[PDB]
Design a protein around this ligand. Structure first.
Ligand code: MG
Ligand code: MG
Ligand code: MG
Ligand code: MG
Ligand code: ZN
Lengths: 52, 161, 196, 205, 190, 134
RNA sequence: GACCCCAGAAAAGGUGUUGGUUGAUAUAGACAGCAGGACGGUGGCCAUGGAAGUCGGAAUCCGCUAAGGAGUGUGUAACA
């Protein structure tokens, strides 16, 4: 029963993020490259999928 | 109080959309706590109450008796605020001084229940004792010995059967 | 095509200044494209409204300064979201009709609210299925005559606070007038003059 | 049941064409070498783009078919089915053999035909696309995608020739104007200033 | 390429004074004293005027990576000035679907107890960094106030609380419970 | 509010429809017409643009008046059974005719452009009947 | 990482850094940020159970304009 304003606050840290397609890393929503060495900083990123 | 109001509104819109009109054969279907058509409480602990019961005990603290209980219900529920210090009802949210006033439901119905719950859950022996005397409840043996949540069950079960 | 668009703007402003010697500088508030078209039709008979880049204007005026002096008074004034309206009519007639053709702009979520609004205690006339919006705002409503009724006045939006999405949908739901604003006359130019 | 292409990547043998000595060759997988609007006139598609190999190697007929389809699908998507014309400029004329193992061993080890490859040289053109000027970025991307079907290293080039002709695009139009070139379908015919004068009188009339 | 000179200057307000011990900046303001040394960065720090108190950071013959340290130092010093004049105040909201998160502030705002996070019996005890004080605000029902002079310590304390209330073995897109940094502001609001 | 506010529009046209239409769904807004009222409403509206007929209605407590706004696709498809410049011209007079126009010539450009669903070279070199309409 | 034979590597990637090529924008105010607008015909046509810019097949216009695609994506049964 989280109110919408708090619900957006939690989703800022849990949901509004990008995911590396090679190494699944959790990245900030404006990311263009992965920050991780093990994938080679690939630009192959996808949005984190919503529960919607 | 807000949780109670949202549920009452949700039930009302259900029985107003799918239901028939007020001028229908049944009459008025919409439920209102001021009418005493809705109760509160817990079935597991065996205690429940209505606006009817609390109007009865405040009339006793204060036919013609049934009439005075009825119009007391309309004052126990709603957006009407009871000043604790002044000791009188009011229609304004703020006092003439400017203090925000608690509504009647929380101030003189929920407050005794919250005080009872707080005292028993915090094991305040003196506070529970004086609350029992003020609420003039009877406590038989084999149940006065128990303490904590079972003591809360026994106390509430007879205060609000 | 961008170069031709800029040169066409320069020819437009220069010719329009030559033809019209009397004009208002007006600052545009948060006015929509509907709002600008509403003003444009209301003034279409006799006046003309020209808006654009400030740097477009200021460069054009400086180039035309030698050809037509006394325009340099506009130079330390064209700042912010402003434009001109050109007219051959009198100051008062332009001003009071431009203040009369205002618009009840809707309350957009995520925008500051200059005005303070408060809902009256009246039957909304809406069906008993829009109760969820009232519950989000915490407004205690009841069903009377088969329609939603507000039991008491609720102070909804204060002055100078951001309008929430739930408030914005409710304002657009009850259709009541929110804060409303249009274009406001910054100053004047009566053949080389400055007034209020 | 085909071997990895790494087993036939390099031009190790002499050319082994299908002839009266090599018989029983299965048909190459690629049978279509021109796609799009092959019937378009010469002046409709003035831009030409090539995929050019940088390695002396062998490209299988399977790979040429895969890259032909890959470039065709992208060109159709971004330019329509009549906005381009593609020509695969490699033909798989070299037969590769296989010595099939279950006599046992290397005795009598000369193999049977397995497939066909095209032998490509450094600087040789593998594939060509001709189209209008405004589709230059689409040709580059289509050829870039088709590079992934080939083993070696390939470069995308935008030729200075007009379409599929052998004449420069900066002198093509005025040669047509002065009748040094005459269109004939997708290409042009070069008319030199020698021969019977009756051909010259056929022109200029 | 090695740039000849890359420099940047910060302005120090009147009520705060900055003292330099080589590459150790000491910022002393009304709210206290902050120290931070940048001996890991090879730069030239200098105080310019007695009139307006400018601090200048120079980097001579720097490549791409070590030209990025000039703005970093200037921003760290500006955070130091901001901390000793206005202070740092990170607000935190505790959100929950069902189980209210109970926060108890132990000795002098240095220890934080999270009791009923997602309804479990384990009690989290998060200790704030030295110089950081946590409190429960009286303006919101579920809000924590972290106050201190060093931004590094205040935000690290807020991150300690945030990472303490972490959901495990569940779908965190659905289970949104926890305490999150709601806004990052100052004290004294100037 | 004129004792009734039923200005909500309708998106049916041509055939009577009745039960097959959305009028049973949106009927409780006034609760007066129901199956009889939408039938008499459509009886007068079956002609006059047998197309989609995006229309607006007003209720007089038993009967309705169904004014059909002049939608460009409606009138062009209705007048179709070619330049027909005079035919479209005569249809642009009783229109709402606002169009954020400056001259009457802008309106005929707008619907000459709408009928592109070629009638575009007319818009390009247009010189005839610019001020003919007013 | 580190020297013929030679004793281990490829396609493909990198907003790590370095150099080079070509192109484009910009004091007529680039770029990035923050802040406003993002309109009418028109809920354009054919499609259908509903597709209103955003499942699709074609079209691809005009006026007001500083500008606004009969639409880049998210979203809705469709709207919003
Ligand atoms: Mg194998
Ligand atoms: Mg051999
Ligand atoms: Mg910063
Ligand atoms: Mg699980
Ligand atoms: Zn990664």
């Amino acid at each position: 029963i989280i109110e919408p304003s708090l619900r957006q606050l939690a989703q800022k840290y849990n949901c509004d993020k990008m995911i590396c397609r090679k190494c699944y890393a959790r990245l900030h929503p404006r990311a263009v490259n992965c920050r991780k060495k093990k994938c080679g900083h690939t630009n192959n990123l996808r949005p984190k999928k919503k529960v919607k | 109080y807000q949780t109670f109001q949202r549920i009452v509104e949700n039930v009302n819109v259900i029985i107003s959309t799918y239901g028939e009109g007020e001028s229908g054969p049944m009459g008025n279907i919409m439920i209102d706590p001021v009418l005493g058509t809705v109760g509160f409480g817990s079935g597991l602990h065996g205690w429940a109450f209505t606006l009817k019961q609390f109007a009865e005990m405040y009339v006793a603290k204060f036919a013609e008796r049934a009439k005075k209980v009825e119009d007391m219900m309309k004052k126990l529920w709603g957006d009407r605020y009871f000043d604790p210090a002044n000791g009188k009802f009011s229609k304004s949210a703020t006092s003439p001084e400017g203090k925000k006033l608690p509504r009647t439901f929380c101030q003189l119905i929920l407050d005794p229940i919250f005080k009872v719950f707080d005292a028993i859950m915090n094991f305040k022996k003196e506070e529970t004792a004086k609350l029992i005397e003020k609420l003039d409840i009877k406590l038989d043996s084999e149940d006065k010995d128990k303490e904590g949540k079972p003591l809360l069950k026994a106390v509430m079960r007879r205060w609000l059967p | 095509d961008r170069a031709t668009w800029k040169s066409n703007y320069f020819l437009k402003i220069i010719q329009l200044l030559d033809d019209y010697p009397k004009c208002f500088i007006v600052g545009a508030d948060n006015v929509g494209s509907k709002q600008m078209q509403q003003i444009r039709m209301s003034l279409r008979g006799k006046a003309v409204v020209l808006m654009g880049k400030n740097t477009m204007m200021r460069k054009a005026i400086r180039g035309h300064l030698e050809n037509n002096p006394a325009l340099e008074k506009l130079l330390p004034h064209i700042r912010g979201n402003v434009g001109f309206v050109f007219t051959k009519e009198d100051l008062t007639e332009i001003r009071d009709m431009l203040l009369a053709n205002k618009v009840p702009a809707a309350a957009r979520a995520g925008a500051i609210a200059p005005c303070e609004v408060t809902v009256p205690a009246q039957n909304t006339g809406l069906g008993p299925e829009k109760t969820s919006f009232f519950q989000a705002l915490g407004i205690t409503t009841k069903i009377s005559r088969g329609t939603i009724e507000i039991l008491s006045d609720v102070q909804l939006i204060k002055t100078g606070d951001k309008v929430g999405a739930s408030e914005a949908t409710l304002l657009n739901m009850l259709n009541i007038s929110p804060f409303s604003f249009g274009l406001v006359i910054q100053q004047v130019f009566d053949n080389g003059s400055i007034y209020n | 049941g085909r071997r990895p292409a790494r087993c036939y990547r390099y031009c190790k043998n002499k050319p082994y064409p299908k002839s009266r000595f090599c018989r029983g060759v299965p048909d190459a997988k690629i049978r279509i070498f021109d796609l799009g609007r092959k019937k378009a006139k010469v002046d409709e598609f003035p831009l030409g783009g090539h995929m050019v190999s940088d390695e002396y190697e062998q490209l299988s007929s399977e790979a040429l078919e895969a890259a032909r389809i890959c470039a065709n699908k992208y060109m159709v998507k971004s330019c329509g089915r009549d906005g381009f014309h593609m020509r695969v400029r490699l033909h798989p004329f070299h037969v590769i053999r296989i010595n099939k193992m279950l006599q046992t061993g290397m005795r009598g080890a000369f193999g049977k035909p397995q497939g066909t490859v095209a032998r490509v040289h450094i600087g040789q053109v593998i594939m060509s696309i001709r189209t209008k000027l405004q589709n230059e970025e689409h040709v580059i991307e289509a050829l870039r995608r088709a590079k992934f079907k080939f083993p070696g290293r390939q470069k995308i080039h935008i030729s200075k020739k007009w379409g599929f002709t052998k004449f420069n695009a900066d002198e093509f139009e005025d040669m047509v104007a002065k009748k040094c070139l005459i269109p004939d379908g997708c290409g042009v015919k070069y008319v030199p200033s020698h021969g019977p004068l009756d051909k010259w009188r056929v022109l200029h009339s | 390429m090695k740039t000849i000179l890359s420099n940047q200057t910060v302005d120090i307000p009147e009520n705060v004074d900055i003292t330099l011990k080589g590459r150790t900046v000491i910022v002393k303001g009304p709210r206290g004293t902050l120290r931070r040394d940048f001996n890991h960065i090879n730069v030239e720090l200098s105080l310019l005027g007695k009139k307006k108190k400018r601090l200048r950071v120079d980097k001579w013959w720097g490549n791409r990576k070590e030209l990025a340290t000039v703005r970093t130092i200037c921003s760290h010093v500006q955070n130091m000035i901001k901390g000793v004049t206005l202070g740092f105040r990170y607000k935190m909201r505790s959100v929950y679907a069902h189980f209210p998160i109970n926060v108890v502030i132990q000795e002098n705002g240095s220890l934080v107890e999270i009791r009923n996070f997602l309804g479990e019996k384990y009690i989290r005890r998060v200790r704030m960094r030295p110089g950081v004080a946590c409190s429960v605000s009286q303006a919101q029902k579920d809000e924590l106030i972290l106050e201190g002079n060093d931004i590094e310590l205040v935000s690290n304390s807020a991150a300690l609380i945030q990472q303490a209330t972490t959901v495990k073995n569940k779908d965190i897109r659905k289970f949104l419970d926890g305490i999150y940094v709601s806004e990052k502001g100052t004290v004294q609001q100037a | 509010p004129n004792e009734i506010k039923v200005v909500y529009l309708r998106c049916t046209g041509g055939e009577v429809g009745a039960t097959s239409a959305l009028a049973p769904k949106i009927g409780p807004l006034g609760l007066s017409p129901k199956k009889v009222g939408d039938d008499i409403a459509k009886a007068t509206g079956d002609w006059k643009g047998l197309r989609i007929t995006v229309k607006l209605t007003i209720q007089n407590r038993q009967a309705q008046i169904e004014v059909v706004p002049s939608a460009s696709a409606l009138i062009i498809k209705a007048l179709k059974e070619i330049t027909f410049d005079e035919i479209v011209n005569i249809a642009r007079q009783m229109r709402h005719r606002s169009l954020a126009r400056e001259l009457s010539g802008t309106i005929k450009e707008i619907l000459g452009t709408a009928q592109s669903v070629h009638p575009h070279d007319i818009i390009d070199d247009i010189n005839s009947g610019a001020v003919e309409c007013p």
